[PDB]
Amino acid sequence: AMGVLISAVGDTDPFFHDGALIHIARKYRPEKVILIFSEHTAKKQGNIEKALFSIAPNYEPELIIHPIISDNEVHIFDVMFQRFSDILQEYYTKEDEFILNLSSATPQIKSALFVINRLNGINVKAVQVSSNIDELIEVNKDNKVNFIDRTIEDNAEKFSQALLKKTARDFIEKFDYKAALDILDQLSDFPNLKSVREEIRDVVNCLSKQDVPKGLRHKKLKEEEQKILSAYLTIELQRERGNVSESFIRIKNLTEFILEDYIKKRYPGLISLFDYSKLLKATKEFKLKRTIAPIIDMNSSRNLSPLDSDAVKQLGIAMKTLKTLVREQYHFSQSDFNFYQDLNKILLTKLN
Amino acid sequence: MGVLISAVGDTDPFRNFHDGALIHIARKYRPEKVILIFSEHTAKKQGNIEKALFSIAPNYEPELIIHDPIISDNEVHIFDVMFQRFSDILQEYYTKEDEFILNLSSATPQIKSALFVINRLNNVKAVQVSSPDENIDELIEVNKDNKVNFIDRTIEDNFSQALLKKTARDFIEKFDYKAALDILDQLSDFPNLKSVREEIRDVVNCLSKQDVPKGLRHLKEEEQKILSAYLTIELQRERGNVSESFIRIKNLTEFILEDYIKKRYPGLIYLSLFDYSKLEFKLKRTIAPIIDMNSHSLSPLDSDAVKQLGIAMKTLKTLVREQYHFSQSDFNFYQDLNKILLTKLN
């Protein structure tokens, strides 16, 4: 990797103490002295060099002269950004660092450098500087090894990630872990990366597989619990999203899973929903038939290739009878019915 | 409402022959809310700026907002300081309903920079006006651009939205309509925007309730369905919802194997797939894999089952095309819609 200072050369460069460029270049000690001079920054072409080189021998750089800058369009706003946005675009800096040495030059440039660096969503440093050719280049106030380095970098989020974060966040809170996941995998290194990713990752993987997610692998009463929880929220979570045709499947599963669970106990089996429906009466069932009814009104009603509109309610009304249904047959908890709410709350706040 | 948050700089109106940034910019884009945050120096020309503004032309005098806090002359040349000072100013009136211009010309250059910084970083726009006390009427009357016909050198340049766009692209390119939708939903107005959304929405809506997308509605009535369901199943596999495939495939075969014996011999004898498997010695060798997926209890799918979710897809795929001639002109619908969509977004 090498360091390229994609920095211009205004009135300040190169000159008791040196100029932002001199300092900028001198302090960061790079391997690419990118210089995009302008109409006035012609003159300084001559000495600017003599400065950069003559600072210290046996420390030789790349001094690449930039399309001269536009003696008129060097105080033009959007132009400044357009030129520079290109200038940055030129040397993409795949595996090197850009020294956006935007401390010196014409206002527009300075502003523009910043907006570039600050915008520029990747590893590229934006920088500032706080305030006889060979003659001056001898008595330079920072012409030694151990000098007061006034160079101080920006150290921002890049703001690229900002949108990324926000935009990925809104999905996690939107209940869309798949969305969130992808968002996140784009996101460049960040502490709470692992915890966001790893978390999202475990949630993702688990859901698809049809296992308990190995996060909500809580101390439940065997598979029947974990799975019974895992499903119970697979449908809930699901219903949260969109898949209003997922419900039917999930429910009709559980509607059975538990249906067979209770039947397995009361009147030990001793052998569809109509198998439930019939079994309900004769086999120590009465109150369960009321419960299991609407549940079994949806599954039969659901059944062509059309989709009713009262079903959009029947789904809802199905859920309460499926939530309520499970609470009875198994005594879970609202503390353990927040699995993902927690996940989201730990998650969201881990994002922040 | 169009409300420009303009600085109150020294070269205000009375800035030579032509009109002066503030008043200049203001006229050009005729705003309804002439937002002005005036600092210590510019505090003098507080009244004048009112005269010129209003005296620019009648039947177009907006309610101007004198900035709530006086600007301090310690933040004149103030670099980042003004950036903050700006940062808050913008935040004060988010007015996502309305739109804003950040007058490039304003006053101290730092405040300028900030005004830019504010605008670049992130609904409201801004453009400066390229170059050429107590005058009052003297200034206004003999104004060099003080007449309806004037040269509009106030020309502004034209990021986050772009980034969001691409962000939302990939989702469409991943075949995630909900995603794409979302990132669109928030997105602002654009030329393709309507269509990119409109279709997206119709496809989500179309996929939502058991019906067939507007586009996909081009075959007979049912054939639309028999097929318009399939691509459902195909879209499924795309985004790893393996769980959905089984019941789609299942519903698929039988919706067809039945709608195939409807005419090839009405028969009576829910009609389970086990029933169809009995009722065509040749057919009963092609729909074997679909009957292989017949045989869970809250349990998961072993590594192998994900294969079955595939051989069956080849079972149902070839099953679709065989019994109904459709052609790869159909089962590219979404392959195209991607390309239409993506082309569109461009």
Residue numbers in the entry:
A (entry chain A): 0 to 14, 17 to 67, 69 to 133, 149 to 288, 301 to 332, 338 to 386
B (entry chain B): 1 to 122, 125 to 134, 147 to 172, 176 to 235, 238 to 288, 299 to 308, 314 to 329, 336 to 386
What do the authors report?
Csm6 ribonucleases bind cOA using a CARF (CRISPR-associated Rossmann Fold) domain, resulting in activation of a fused HEPN (Higher Eukaryotes and Prokaryotes Nucleotide binding) ribonuclease domain. Here we characterised the cyclic hexa-adenylate (cA6) activated Csm6’ ribonuclease from the industrially important bacterium Streptococcus thermophilus. StCsm6’ is symmetrical dimer, with each monomer displaying a CARF domain (residues 1–173), a central 6H domain (residues 174–239), and a HEPN domain (residues 240–386). In the dimer, each domain interacts with the equivalent domain in the other monomer, but they cross over each other at the 6H domains to give an ‘X’ arrangement.
Apo StCsm6’ proved to be extremely difficult to crystallize, and only a single crystal in a dehydrated drop of mother liquor following ∼1 year of incubation was obtained. Aside from a couple of disordered regions, the peptide backbone of apo StCsm6’ could be built with confidence, but far fewer side chains were modelled due to the low resolution of the data. The structure revealed that apo StCsm6’, like in the complex with cA6, is a symmetrical dimer in an ‘X’ arrangement. Strikingly, however, the overall structure for apo StCsm6’ and in complex with cA6 were markedly different, with an RMSD of 7.7 Å over 327 Cα atoms for the monomer and 4.9 Å over 441 Cα atoms for the dimer (however, there are 386 residues in the monomer and 772 residues in the dimer, meaning the RMSDs over the full length dimeric protein would be much higher). The only difference to note is that one of the loops in the CARF domain (residues 133–149), which encloses the active site in the complex with cA6, could not be modelled in the apo structure, presumably due to conformational flexibility in this region which may not be stabilized until cA6 is bound. Unfortunately, a number of the active site residues could not be modelled in the apo StCsm6’ structure; this could reflect the flexibility in this region prior to cA6 binding which forms the functional active site, but also could be a consequence of the lower resolution data. One caveat is that the EiCsm6 structure may have been influenced by the presence of a non-hydrolysable cA6 mimic bound to the CARF domains.
